[PDB]
């Protein structure tokens, strides 16, 4: 199974502004954790056709579980949007130490406010661990030596395969490669503005936007590296886990193993897609603060 533990729950979070004004946060381990048990629950029901019908009920519970969790993280809206409008000062300052300190504070208050609800979240996540784990314990076979892996196959086909091939069709190394040129430019444009050239203003902000972008790129480097791994791992693994029988225990081991592999895979792919957006979200605001190729 997968438990939740301690972790310094400060850096176990990411704050991501897809478009200008639509900022949100993650809580990696939760998202892994919930997803982990989302797959398990499916796998559990699909293993027989006698219980494929649960899909509606499970969709139900999972729809709810997110609509529950989303409502909780809502309690941090008026503090999150306190950040948003502080960002908007940073990404549109058309003084600085104060606009920085304001960002660091309004951010830390958003962290705390999340951490505060560390236990309101756990109940949702434990309720999910419950549902997913209560099935799985229900997963019966026709013959324990010789259990059927069509369960895992259908679950791979529908929910997963679509996302693998998406990652294969998108050349994420290009994606990275490009961003590292984007930063190269920012860097070149910033080195140009440096020098004794009197001293044009805003540069502080640019520096900050760039710095921020770097940290984003480095995160995207990371989740991307994990993605490409798990792709090969998932693809290798799934081959071994279909069109065959299993011993009940080895089976259960597989599903969990996969439920794990998928979860990590998705979480990354997710954060990547969010970060990617957040990357260029800054590029626009950074590009804006230029006005044109050279004022």
């Amino acid at each position: 199974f997968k438990e939740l533990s301690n972790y310094n729950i400060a850096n176990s979070i990411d704050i991501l502004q897809e478009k200008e004004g639509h900022l949100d946060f993650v809580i990696i381990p939760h998202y892994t954790f919930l997803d982990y048990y989302k797959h398990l629950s499916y796998n559990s029901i699909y293993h027989k056709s006698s219980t494929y019908g649960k899909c509606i009920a499970v969709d139900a519970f999972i729809k709810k579980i997110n609509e529950a969790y989303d409502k909780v993280k809502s309690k941090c809206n008026d503090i999150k949007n306190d950040l948003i409008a502080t960002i908007k000062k940073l990404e549109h300052p058309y003084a600085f130490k104060k606009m920085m300190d304001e960002y660091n504070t309004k951010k830390k208050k958003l962290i705390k406010c999340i951490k505060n609800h560390e236990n309101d979240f756990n109940k949702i996540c434990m309720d999910m661990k419950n549902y997913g784990t209560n099935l799985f314990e229900q997963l019966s076979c026709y013959n324990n030596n010789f259990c059927n892996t069509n369960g895992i196959r259908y679950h791979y086909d529908e929910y997963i395969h679509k996302l693998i091939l998406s990652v294969k069709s998108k050349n994420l190394n290009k994606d990275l490669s490009d961003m590292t040129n984007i930063l190269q430019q920012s860097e070149l444009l910033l080195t140009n503005l440096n020098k004794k050239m009197g001293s044009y203003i805003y540069i502080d902000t640019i520096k900050f936007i760039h710095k921020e972008m770097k940290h984003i790129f480095n995160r995207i480097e990371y989740h991307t590296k994990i993605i490409n791994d798990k792709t090969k791992i998932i693809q290798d693994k799934i081959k071994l886990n279909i069109w065959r029988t299993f011993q009940k225990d080895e089976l259960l081991k597989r599903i969990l193993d996969m439920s794990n592999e998928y979860s990590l895979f998705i979480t990354s792919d997710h954060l990547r897609q969010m970060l990617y957006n957040t990357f260029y979200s800054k590029e626009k605001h950074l590009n804006n603060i230029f006005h044109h190729l050279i004022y």
Partner: antibody, heavy 123, light 109 residues
Framework: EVQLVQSGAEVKKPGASVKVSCKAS????????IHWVRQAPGQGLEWMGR????????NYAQEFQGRVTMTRDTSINTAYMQLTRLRSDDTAVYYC????????????????WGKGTTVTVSS | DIQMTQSPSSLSASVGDRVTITCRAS??????LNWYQQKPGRAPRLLIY???TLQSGVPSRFSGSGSGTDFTLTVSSLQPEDFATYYC??????????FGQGTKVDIRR
């Protein structure tokens, strides 16, 4: 170096029990599965079960289901295999081995073996 | 419920011969099949794992092969020090099935 160390030969009567040990030394104990393969006199190898030192989970052949009981203590890095309801035929050499060659993610080979324990069942 | 059958159970081989030991699975098992040497009154030695990879340090005359049901262990030039009983083990399904009877390697003539 990498070493498996088993208890000394035992002798037990029809319808006693028998515990044998397997001290893992060299490597981290709870990494690799530890397995118990016995061998009748002048006979083939015979897989009995396994135990995940880490979890404590056990998988037994069905021949020994309900007779064998595998355990381990992580203070000492020792894995155990207790048979019960002993019989003439249970007379064998009990080996223990290490699935530490993971060759296909879930697929392992018994890379290290202990020299193995002579259990005699006589009366 | 995977039954591993080794052919010849017992055979006769002079030094410097090639020795090829067969091992058939009752069902398809991929390349999940390891090979063991066991000298009279010794612990089994792991030679070949995963049907045809060779365990570090093992003499390179031992060569695993085959797939699906039929597997082969091949000693290029049989040596004195190889006069053992050999065992093949399927790992495809995890009550690892009892290795097939194993094969005897005498001298000959």
């Amino acid at each position: 170096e990498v070493q498996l160390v088993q208890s000394g030969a035992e002798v037990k009567k029809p319808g006693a029990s028998v515990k044998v040990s397997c001290k893992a030394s060299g490597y981290t104990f709870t990494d690799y599965y530890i397995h118990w393969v016995r061998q009748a006199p002048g006979q083939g190898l015979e897989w009995m079960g396994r135990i995940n030192p880490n979890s404590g989970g056990t998988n037994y052949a069905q021949e020994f289901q309900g007779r064998v009981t595998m355990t381990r203590d992580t203070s000492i890095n020792t894995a155990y295999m207790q048979l019960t309801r002993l019989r003439s035929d249970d007379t064998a050499v009990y080996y223990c081995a290490r699935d530490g060659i993971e060759y296909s993610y879930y697929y392992y080979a018994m890379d290290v073996w202990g020299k193995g324990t002579t259990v005699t069942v006589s009366s | 419920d995977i039954q591993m059958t080794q052919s010849p159970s017992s055979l006769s081989a002079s030094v410097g011969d090639r020795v090829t030991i067969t091992c058939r699975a009752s069902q398809s098992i991929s390349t999940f099949l390891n090979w063991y040497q066991q000298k009279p009154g010794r612990a089994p030695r792991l030679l070949i794992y995963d049907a045809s990879t060779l365990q570090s340090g093992v003499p390179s005359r031992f060569s695993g092969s085959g797939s699906g049901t039929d597997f082969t262990l091949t000693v290029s030039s049989l040596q004195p020090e190889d006069f053992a009983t050999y065992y093949c083990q399927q790992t495809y399904n995890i009550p690892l099935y009892t290795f097939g009877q194993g094969t005897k390697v005498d001298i000959r003539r």
